[model samples]
Target: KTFKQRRTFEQRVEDVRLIREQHPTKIPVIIERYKGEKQLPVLDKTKFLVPDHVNMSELIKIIRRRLQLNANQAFFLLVNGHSMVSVSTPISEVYESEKDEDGFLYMVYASQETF
Candidate 1:
């Protein structure tokens, strides 16, 4: 019996969007710049807002754009010491667990040449 259900993947996606639209809060994020070829504003921030339900990868895109970096450049992001950046991760998870004693979520970034 090959019967299809009425619920679909696209519908699931729309449902998730609706849930996120209701999310609300201010997330504080801190930056630790590791010195790079191009200067990024990440170093200048004492603290920044990550907004409710924003994904980590979205912030990554914002970082690249803020620096006006070229495709040749490599950008890396990290939090909670040695944890690899997880794109699908929500900002709230990072904000609560990785926040430093200074009352800010500790995050790191570095960008350099491919070679």
Candidate 2:
């Protein structure tokens, strides 16, 4: 069986104090208030009109300017869908070299245009 109950603020404080009293040398933790939700600006593909032969460096530069990203910030991925436009590799290749701590790669791709 499970018991559900709510503790008053004073009761919570007393319980914390008791625990701290038992471990006198232990550090007391303070939780900070969270700020409002963070939002990222959306990208508009219409702004990116380039010839098929554009170099990766040039494309990266254009993307950085469009996304308002600084040089120090890393550019993770770029996924291009079928447009009858063929390149050496899928645009998502940009993020292929990067992996998270767990060694799993995360990639996001969506294209409204059809081939």
Candidate 3:
């Protein structure tokens, strides 16, 4: 009855169907890394998928880890070139608002402060 539902909800979120979650939650994205004015070594996988619900702060952490950036190093991330994203800004909203005709939302990350 409602007992099972109550228990699952109490512990945490309900288990989602992989087939559904995999299809909808994941959104294709392209992250362009920059060191000053020069671009980093491009790879086939740099342009890939990320969950739509991820916020800017979360994404930055992952990017820092992925790029092996040190804590002392500064990082600046921009959405669509000019607009900067907040810590709580959802990637889905950024994607929806700023993606291009080819459907690539250009995420540019720099080691220096731009703002």
Candidate 4:
């Protein structure tokens, strides 16, 4: 099971936008655990994951339309000062769905048992 911080629907949409803007035309960014080498895929956007051939303005507009965001609310994040971030698990592998009170929806891998 995995524990996730509560976030507003708007915040969740913003997070997706931030991710797309950051790695536009590239593989989905990987999400890793704060601890050890554990990692998991968080987002899979292969459909629009093209490189320079992609149009930035068009992509931004498409994202806004898909999210149904107002002109003023359409915004993305800017990551500064970093060569390249690495990931143990690729975002393409991560699955997403609604979570329940039991918190079992976020499980990435099987738990380890004591020898």
CA-lDDT, candidates in order: 0.60, 0.35, 0.62, 0.33
Model 2 C-alpha lDDT per residue in residues 7-110, reported as the tens digit of each score: 45565456446644675433222211112212324455321223334444655455568668665654433332112232343223432333222222222222
In angstroms, what RMSD does candidate 1 have relative to the true structure?
A: 16.5
In Å, residue 43's CA in model 3 sits off its true spot by: 6.9
Q: Which candidate is the best by TM-score?
A: 3
After TM-score superposition, what is the CA distance of residue 80 in candidate 2 from its true location, in Å? 5.0
lDDT of 4: 0.33
Clashing pairs in 4: 41-91, 41-94
Q: 44-105, model 3: which lDDT tens digit per residue?
A: 34555678899878888887778666768777777777756467879888778887544556
Q: All predictions: root-mean-square deviation over Cα?
A: 16.5, 21.7, 13.9, 16.3
Worst 10 residues of 1 by lDDT: 1-10
Residue 23 accuracy (lDDT) in model 2: 50
Pairs in clash, predicted candidate 2: none
The per-residue C-alpha lDDT of model 2 at residue 45 equals 34
Give the TM-score of each candidate.
0.62, 0.31, 0.66, 0.26
Q: Would you give me the overall lDDT of model 2? A: 0.35
Task: State the displacement of the C-alpha of residue 81, model 2, in Å, after optimal TM-score superposition.
Answer: 8.2
TM-score for candidate 1:
0.62
lDDT of 1 by residue, 56-111 (tens): 88888877786677887778777755555578888877667665544446667775
